[PDB]
Amino acid sequence: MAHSPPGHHSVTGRPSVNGLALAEYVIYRGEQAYPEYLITYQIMRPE
Amino acid sequence: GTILIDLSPDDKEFQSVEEEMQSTVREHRDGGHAGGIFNRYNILKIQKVCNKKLWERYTHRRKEVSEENHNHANERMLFHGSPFVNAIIHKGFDERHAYIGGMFGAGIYFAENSSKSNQYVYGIGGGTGCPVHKDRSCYICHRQLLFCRVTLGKSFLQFS
Numbered sequence: 001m002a003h004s005p006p007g008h009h010s011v012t013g014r015p016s017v018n019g020l021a022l023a024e025y026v027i028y029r030g031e032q033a034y035p036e037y038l039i040t041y042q043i044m045r046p047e
Numbered sequence: 048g049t050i051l052i053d054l055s056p057d058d059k060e061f062q063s064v065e066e067e068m069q070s071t072v073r074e075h076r077d078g079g080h081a082g083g084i085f086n087r088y089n090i091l092k093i094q095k096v097c098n099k100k101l102w103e104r105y106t107h108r109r110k111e112v113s114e115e116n117h118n119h120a121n122e123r124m125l126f127h128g129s130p131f132v133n134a135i136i137h138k139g140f141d142e143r144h145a146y147i148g149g150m151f152g153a154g155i156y157f158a159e160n161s162s163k164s165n166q167y168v169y170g171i172g173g174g175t176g177c178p179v180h181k182d183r184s185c186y187i188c189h190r191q192l193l194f195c196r197v198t199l200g201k202s203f204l205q206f207s
């Protein structure tokens with residue numbers, strides 16, 4: 001993995017074109033996330 | 048050392064996790080190419096992931112970050128999709144779970160939109176889709192996402 005930008009612990013990707021998209025995030029140390037919930041699902045075919 | 052505890056659909060915790068999953072679906076610019084065509088999910092199971100060692104690893108790092116950032120971990124709950132979800136729940140996140148070619152550099156990626164993380168369940172760009180039918184829009188095969196506690200600390204803002 002890469003390093004965080006100096007003086008930072010993560011990166012936030014802020015969309016600037018798609019007004020409806022939410023943010024994306026990147027961490028560079030696996031210790032900075034804990035997998036709290038495992039969600040099992042299917043995508044649903046639209047009616 | 049991981050055990051998985053099934054949550055009842057009657058449990059407020061199941062309900063708040065499901066609501067975050069469903070309410071953060073959006074339309075994608077690929078028209079569904081990577082993740083499939085859908086507006087909602089059929090939730091089949093939500094399990095709490097319990098591993099003491101992995102939790103202590105997380106909280107140890109969280110304290111390090113907080114102390115570097117005026118006692119503020121900047122902790123979020125975010126989605127992660129990956130072909131190695133079952134590895135992550137047993138062994139934790141590490142460099143093998145990084146997206147080397149991602150737009151914000153080689154690191155581990157998370158999304159506020161559940162449907163963004165859904166694009167990565169079968170690999171980058173959806174790969175070849177589900178193993179059984181080779182369909183990125185499969186409505187039959189079971190998928191899994193992780194809903195993760197993530198320490199952001201001081202986060203570098205990259206505009207789109």
Ligand SMILES: CN(CCO)c1ccc(-c2nc3cc(Cl)ccc3c(=O)[nH]2)cc1
Pocket residue numbers: 024025126127128129130131143144145146147149156157158163164165167170171
């Ligand atoms: C382990 N790998 C590479 C698999 O060969 C992997 C790559 C990407 C992802 C992934 N990337 C994202 C990118 C954005 Cl912008 C938002 C969310 C995700 C995500 O949930 N997983 C997960 C695992």
Ligand SMILES: [Zn+2]
Pocket residue numbers: 177178179180181182185186187188
């Ligand atoms: Zn399938």
